[PDB]
Design a protein around this ligand. Structure first.
Ligand code: 8SF
Length: 146
């Protein structure tokens, strides 16, 4: 497949450098430099339980890409014990070949949150990376609320 081959070259050239989350406030809730976008292994992350109380969270996401992309975008789903509770769409747009970029997103909560003690270890965030319609990778991060 010509498309399959293109997705793999994009994946091969892609790196998530660092990321953080802030209350939208302005206060840093979490930050890391693990590439949570790597597919095929379940990532784990520890986040402050207070995040469950925020109406909105601001994410900063720094990434590099050898390959040019025309419409880089994400689809993210929150799963609780295997059931999708919420889905988010974010678009970055055009990506220059061999660039490093910082991408700011606003994540809003829809609905009433279960307590942290119930959620912890039972939430998975599934992320799909797209160039327009081309699925480049799928990764998963299990959340613990501390
Ligand atoms: C690979 C995706 C970018 S993971 C992701 N997307 N928004 N928040 N978030 C995250 C941030 C810290 C811990 C667990 C999940």
């Amino acid at each position: 497949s010509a498309k399959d081959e293109r997705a793999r070259e994009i994946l091969r050239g892609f790196k998530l450098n660092w990321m953080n989350l802030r209350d939208a406030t302005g206060k840093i809730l979490w930050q890391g430099t693990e590439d949570l976008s790597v597919p095929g292994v379940e990532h784990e992350a520890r986040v402050p339980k207070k995040i469950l109380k925020c109406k909105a969270v601001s994410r900063e996401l720094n990434f590099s890409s050898t390959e040019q992309m025309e419409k880089f975008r994400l689809e993210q789903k929150v799963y609780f014990k295997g059931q999708c509770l919420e889905e988010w769409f974010f678009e970055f747009g055009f990506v220059i070949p061999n660039s490093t970029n910082t991408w700011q997103s606003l994540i809003e909560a829809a609905s009433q949150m279960m307590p942290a003690s119930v959620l912890t270890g039972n939430v998975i965030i599934e992320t799909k990376f797209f160039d327009d319609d081309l699925l480049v990778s799928t990764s998963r991060v299990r959340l613990f609320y501390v």
